[PDB]
Amino acid sequence: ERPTFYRQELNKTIWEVPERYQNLSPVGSGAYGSVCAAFDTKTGHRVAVKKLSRPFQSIIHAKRTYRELRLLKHMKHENVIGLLDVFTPARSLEEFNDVYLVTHLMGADLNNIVKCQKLTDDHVQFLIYQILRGLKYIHSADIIHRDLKPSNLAVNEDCELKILDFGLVATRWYRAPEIMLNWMHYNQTVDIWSVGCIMAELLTGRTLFPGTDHIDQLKLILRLVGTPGAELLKKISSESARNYIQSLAQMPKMNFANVFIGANPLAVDLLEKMLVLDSDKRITAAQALAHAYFAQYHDPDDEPVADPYDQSFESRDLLIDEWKSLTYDEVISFVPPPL
Numbered sequence: 001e002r003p004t005f006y007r008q009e010l011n012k013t014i015w016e017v018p019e020r021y022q023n024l025s026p027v028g029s030g031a032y033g034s035v036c037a038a039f040d041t042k043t044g045h046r047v048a049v050k051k052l053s054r055p056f057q058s059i060i061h062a063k064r065t066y067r068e069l070r071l072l073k074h075m076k077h078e079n080v081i082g083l084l085d086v087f088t089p090a091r092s093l094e095e096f097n098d099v100y101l102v103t104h105l106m107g108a109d110l111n112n113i114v115k116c117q118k119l120t121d122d123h124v125q126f127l128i129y130q131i132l133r134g135l136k137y138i139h140s141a142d143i144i145h146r147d148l149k150p151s152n153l154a155v156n157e158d159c160e161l162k163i164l165d166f167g168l169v170a171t172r173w174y175r176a177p178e179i180m181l182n183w184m185h186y187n188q189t190v191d192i193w194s195v196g197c198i199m200a201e202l203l204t205g206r207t208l209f210p211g212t213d214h215i216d217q218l219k220l221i222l223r224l225v226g227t228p229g230a231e232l233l234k235k236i237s238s239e240s241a242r243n244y245i246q247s248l249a250q251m252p253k254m255n256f257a258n259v260f261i262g263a264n265p266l267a268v269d270l271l272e273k274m275l276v277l278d279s280d281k282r283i284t285a286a287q288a289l290a291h292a293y294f295a296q297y298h299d300p301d302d303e304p305v306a307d308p309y310d311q312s313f314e315s316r317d318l319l320i321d322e323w324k325s326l327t328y329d330e331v332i333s334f335v336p337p338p339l
């Protein structure tokens with residue numbers, strides 16, 4: 001029983017959606033699609049509807065479309081955005097040319113919230129706990145976010161948090177030195193670097209490392225954490241990067257307690273464990289949840305891992321119509337979650 005659809009124009013964009021979804025109004029537009037808020041007549045809840053921009057125009061657009069649907073269909077966790085619905089007005093593979101994605105509608109993001117003023121220590125404990133609980137889940141499936149920043153963390157009035165990616169404040173301000181500079185092997189803990197930058201900003205009300213470019217960014221980071229020692233220099237394979245590092249005048253590591261003055265000492269200790277250059281030594285999400293800073297919230301019996309995720313498609317080079325047929329299969333096979 002294919003539902004009945006209706007059509008309108010919003011900010012120069014045409015939208016065709018089932019009658020289930022009423023009173024659409026624009027929230028935001030980005031590189032890869034635009035979002036509206038809607039009322040879901042079947043649940044009586046507000047939702048977000050994303051219409052992908054030219055989803056099958058090139059091989060790269062088609063693979064990105066497939067990737068976003070595969071990731072959204074996987075996510076079943078309280079602190080990660082989830083898929084409530086996916087539809088197309090198309091009746092056949094042949095007509096298939098538009099993809100719409102439906103999630104919960106959140107109240108605000110942490111960019112909005114910190115721009116107002118800095119947060120209390122109790123609010124920081126609860127927000128960073130929920131981020132790490134979400135990251136333990138996605139990291140357990142070998143999924144890396146890679147673009148964490150305050151605008152990708154969405155909250156309701158009761159402070160319940162979900163990690164999302166809107167797909168665009170500079171990304172470089174939150175990016176791990178090893179992935180920004182390609183200077184060492186990189187794992188899930190690029191995301192723990194971003195969390196440390198975000199937690200500092202929620203506590204102080206100030207961007208920790210507001211670099212103008214990749215060179216200025218590295219200079220601001222090294223002023224806090226210190227120039228690499230001989231033991232970390234051993235692990236850098238890029239001769240360009242090592243030459244550049246060793247061509248700078250040495251800087252000592254600062255005492256974080258002398259930078260974040262009058263913060264909770266357990267908050268300062270956790271920032272010292274997150275903002276380390278050596279990606280082998282940086283704290284994991286699972287280890288961070290057991291840290292004393294989270295004593296009020298930590299429950300080792302309610303921090304679940306994910307089902308395994310098949311990311312073998314990431315290594316494939318296919319034609320537009322192949323990525324399009326794969327995406328069609330995932331729309332057809334979608335099972336909605338419990339009401």
Ligand SMILES: Cc1ccc(C(=O)N[C@@H](CCC2CCCCC2)C(N)=O)cc1NC(=O)c1cnn(-c2ccccc2)c1C(F)(F)F
Pocket residue numbers: 027028035048049050067068071072080081101102103104105106107108109138144145154163164165166167
């Ligand atoms: C409809 C929709 C569709 C797709 C996504 C989305 O996160 N896609 C990701 C998926 C994969 C990610 C992997 C790493 C972990 C996180 C997921 C992507 N880019 O591929 C989000 C929304 N929803 C929203 O994006 C949404 C839901 N409230 N709000 C919202 C936020 C703040 C204030 C008001 C509304 C928004 C928005 F950002 F637009 F404004």
